[PDB]
Amino acid sequence: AEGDDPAKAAFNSLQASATEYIGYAWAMVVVIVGATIGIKLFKKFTSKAS
């Protein structure tokens, strides 16, 4: 509750956007896992064990 400084709010909000990145952090962890696994199946899914 401060003076009429909403003009600075919308501006400072851009700093909160950082969350958008921290939110995908988990997905980045999942991505990593997916990649690691894929690199295998992706390679083993070429000629298989016949």
Curated annotation (Swiss-Prot):
CC per GO annotation: helical viral capsid; host cell plasma membrane; membrane
Keyword field: Capsid protein, Helical capsid protein, Host cell inner membrane, Host cell membrane, Host membrane, Membrane, Signal, Transmembrane, Transmembrane helix, Virion
Keyword Heme set for record: no
Main location group: virion
Membrane topology: Single-pass type I membrane protein
UniProt KW Signal keyword: yes
Cytoplasmic side: 46-50
Positions in the Periplasmic compartment: 1-24
Cysteine pairings via disulfide bonds: none
Membrane-spanning ranges: 25-45
Subunit field text: Homomultimerizes. There are about 2,700 copies of this protein in the phage capsid.
Its biological purpose: Self assembles to form a helical capsid wrapping up the viral genomic DNA. The capsid displays a filamentous structure with a length of 760-1950 nm and a width of 6-8 nm. The virion assembly and budding take place at the host inner membrane.
Family from the record: Belongs to the inovirus capsid protein family.
Name of the protein described by the UniProt record: Capsid protein G8P
Whole-protein residues included: 24 to 73 of 73
